[PDB]
């Protein structure tokens, strides 16, 4: 199957994601709409249910609204049963229309549809080459008070937030958001926090997602990743990747293109991507708010490409469920159109929040979750997506391409996306009133005459190369032209690998060009993977079995016909199955600004390193207070580990003295190991 094929659940780079609040799209079946106050036909009270369902989505798929738009994957609201009750925050009746207040992760939300409806929707999407991505919010249940934040395991009850004897939840009050630990271990407002170190919860959630992947979901958009321990998440991911690997991204909110240490961290160590708020901010500051210029935009591109191990897996967007719509009264259509184009031709997996093609407005929650107004295919923005979306599939330079600043200034940007012998050039002039005389533009386009892929719908123009040298031209006011160049690759050149972390035995997908149809050999580091280990092999996609080599960070290489492909770095190989173990050290007092890390005899703790590979810095305030620190780590299961803490501050490392501490991990689930600092 090609990298392109709907089948490719491990890579979304060639797709376009359509984010849609299920309830706010189409009530394709009235026979399942809420009754009474908890419902509102008009859908004027955005806080109540409006009727949207899975049949509605099915209908749109079937009349090619999506197929005409160009979107290749739907991102739906969480499908699980949510609380049936209603909460009255400040006199206003609030419903769980959003999907985010789960009560039974093992049952479908009746208001969206049934299990068979869901199955019906998973089959109809694949038939048209559309993938389905789902929201999964394992952080918490529903707001305490609605239903005492109860959780049912497929009907049967697990426990409520109150008189929670076995401790399935956290009872440390709610997060004031003053630190990463305060956000992880304390509730989100009234949202009942689950205690993941609790083993039945750890297993409830591995068992839950398993069910959904089993039914055919193609990707999972995890919610509130900054509110759950990394260690746990990673372990959960290894469970998923070991069963049915699927593209997983999470939401870790940021408020700028500004780099963030914990953000970049999670993005490179959890085993899942993030939503690109750094990008979003720059895309909005330049195109929307007029608070930064093309420089800011370019500066973001280089920096993100530099911070994230695999920038191509981040998920770009111009707006979403947690912000003001891109469109407002001062923002004009061309500007929306420009942001879309910029995003569709950009690096990463892009997502369009529902109704952007219909210029929908709505500032803040919930006005930005208005009902889908039209199914019009005429808008210019609708046009732009249909034109461009298809390119991610046809041109691999858009999909896996690098980015090169080829001409820039305050209003004008011309960047280059190139992968192997393929290219795409994109010129953007955010100035709505004055055009720009471009002189001395240089690209990698072979000599020839190029026609703006956008047929001029965004005042685009044609160009002419002369061995990369483009002839002098004028870029009209508010223009944006795209000129590409494609050809058959003849050299194994790796474009993606999914997932990027796993234990030996798992199956990974390598996407790219020029692999030929004759099984060569894979290279996990310096270890050739051949023959039967290579489950599948064709020009654009090779499915290969992760060899059983020492856990660690490898680079992947595909050698087709003796020619070695380029190397895909930072591919993480696990020791084996994981379990989440909480490490607690006592009397581990420190000096001002001195911190506590952890490392031991397995790649998962960092193989005795004191660097960027050691676990930490351990927490010291919510679950355990200073001088006791603690930190939840993903760690090989069943195996006996040796570990040791260490304080680190200026540059100087002080290891605990005496022998190494020891712990033989549990064969499954979770565990806690307490130790005294030596
Ligand atoms: Ca309905
Ligand atoms: Ca939490």
Curated annotation (Swiss-Prot):
Protein residues bound to Ca(2+) 2: 139, 184, 193, 227
Cofactor note text: Binds 2 calcium ions per subunit.
Start and end residues of each stretch annotated as A1: 1-138
Top-rank taxon, per record: Bacteria
Keywords: Calcium, Disulfide bond, Glycosyltransferase, Metal-binding, Secreted, Signal, Transferase
EC number: 2.4.1.19
CBM20 domain location: 573-678
Location of region: E: 575-678
GO cellular-component term (any): extracellular region
Cofactors: Ca(2+)
Site residues (Transition state stabilizer), renumbered to this chain: 322
Region (D): 489-574
Gene Ontology BP terms: carbohydrate metabolic process
Substrates-to-products reaction catalysed: Cyclizes part of a (1->4)-alpha-D-glucan chain by formation of a (1->4)-alpha-D-glucosidic bond
Record-annotated IPT/TIG domain positions: 492-572
Cystine bridges: 43-50
SUPFAM superfamilies: (Trans)glycosidases, E set domains, Glycosyl hydrolase domain, Starch-binding domain-like
Record's comment describing the protein's domains: May consist of two protein domains: the one in the N-terminal side cleaves the alpha-1,4-glucosidic bond in starch, and the other in the C-terminal side catalyzes other activities, including the reconstitution of an alpha-1,4-glucosidic linkage for cyclizing the maltooligosaccharide produced.
Self-association state and partner proteins as the record states: Monomer.
PANTHER family per the UniProt record, alphabetical: ALPHA-AMYLASE 1, ALPHA-AMYLASE FAMILY MEMBER
Name of this protein: Cyclomaltodextrin glucanotransferase
Organism annotation: Niallia circulans
């Amino acid at each position: 199957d090609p990298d392109t094929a709907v089948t490719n659940k491990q890579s979304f780079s060639t797709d376009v994601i359509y984010q849609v609040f299920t309830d706010r799209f189409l009530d394709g079946n009235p026979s399942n709409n809420p009754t009474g106050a908890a419902y509102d036909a008009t859908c004027s009270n955005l806080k109540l249910y409006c009727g949207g369902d899975w049949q509605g989505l099915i209908n749109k798929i079937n009349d090619n609204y999506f197929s005409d738009l160009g979107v290749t994957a739907l991102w739906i609201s969480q499908p699980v049963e949510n609380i049936f009750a209603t909460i009255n925050y400040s006199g206003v009746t609030n419903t769980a229309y959003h999907g985010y207040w789960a009560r039974d992760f093992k049952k479908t939300n009746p208001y969206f549809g049934t299990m068979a409806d869901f199955q019906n929707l998973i089959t109809t999407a694949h038939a048209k080459g559309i993938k389905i991505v789902i929201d999964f919010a394992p952080n918490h249940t529903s707001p305490a008070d609605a239903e005492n934040g109860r959780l049912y395991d497929n009907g049967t009850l697990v426990g409520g937030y109150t008189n929670d004897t076995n401790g399935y939840f956290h009872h440390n009050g709610g997060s004031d958001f003053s630190s990463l630990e305060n956000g992880i271990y304390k509730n989100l407002y009234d949202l009942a926090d689950f205690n993941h170190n609790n083993a039945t919860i750890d297993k409830y959630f591995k068992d839950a997602i398993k069910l959904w992947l089993d039914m055919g979901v193609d990707g999972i958009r995890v919610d509130a990743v900054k509110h759950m321990p990394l260690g746990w998440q990673k372990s959960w991911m290894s469970s998923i990747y070991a069963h049915k690997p699927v593209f997983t991204f999470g939401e870790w909110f940021l408020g700028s293109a500004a780099s963030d240490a914990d953000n970049t961290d999670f993005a490179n160590k959890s085993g899942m991507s993030l939503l690109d708020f750094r990008f979003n901010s720059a895309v909005r500051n330049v195109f929307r708010d007029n608070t930064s210029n093309m420089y800011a935009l370019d500066s973001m591109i280089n920096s993100t490409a530099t911070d994230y191990n695999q920038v191509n897996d981040q998920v770009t967007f111009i707006d979403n469920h947690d912000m003001d719509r891109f469109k407002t009264s001062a923002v004009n259509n061309r500007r929306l159109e420009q942001a879309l184009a910029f995003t569709l031709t950009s690096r990463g997996v892009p997502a369009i929040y529902y109704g952007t093609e219909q210029y929908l407005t709505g500032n803040g929650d919930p006005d930005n979750r208005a009902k889908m107004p039209s199914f019009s295919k005429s808008t210019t923005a609708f046009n732009v997506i249909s034109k461009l979306a298809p390119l991610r599939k046809s041109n691999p330079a858009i999909a896996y391409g690098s980015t090169q600043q080829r001409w820039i200034n305050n209003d004008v940007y011309v960047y280059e996306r190139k992968f192997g012998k393929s290219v795409a050039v994109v010129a953007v002039n955010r100035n709505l009133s004055t055009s720009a005389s471009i002189t001395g533009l240089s690209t990698s386009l072979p000599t020839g005459s190029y026609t703006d892929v956008l047929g001029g719908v965004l005042n685009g123009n044609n160009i002419t190369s002369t061995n990369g040298s483009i002839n002098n031209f004028t870029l009209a006011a508010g223009a944006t032209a795209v000129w590409q160049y494609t050809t058959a690759e003849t050299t194994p050149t790796i474009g993606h690998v999914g997932p990027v972390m796993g234990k030996p035995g798992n199956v990974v997908t390598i996407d790219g060009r020029g692999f030929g149809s004759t099984k060569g050999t894979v290279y996990f580091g310096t270890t050739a993977v051949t023959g039967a280990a290579i489950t599948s092999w064709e020009d654009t996609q090779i499915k290969v079995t992760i060899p059983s080599v020492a856990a660690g960070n490898y680079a992947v290489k595909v050698a087709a016909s003796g020619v070695n492909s380029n190397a895909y770095n930072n591919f993480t190989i696990l020791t084996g199955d994981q379990v989440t173990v909480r490490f607690v050290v006592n009397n581990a007092s420190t000096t001002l600004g001195q911190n506590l890390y952890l490392t031991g005899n397995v790649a998962e703790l960092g193989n005795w390193s004191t660097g960027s590979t050691a676990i930490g810095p351990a927490f010291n305030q919510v679950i355990h207070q200073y001088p006791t620190w603690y930190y939840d780590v993903s760690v090989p299961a069943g195996k006996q580990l040796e570990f040791k803490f260490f304080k680190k501050n200026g540059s100087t490392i002080t290891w605990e003295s005496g022998s190494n501490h020891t712990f033989t991990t549990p064969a499954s689930g979770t565990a806690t190991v307490t130790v005294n600092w030596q």
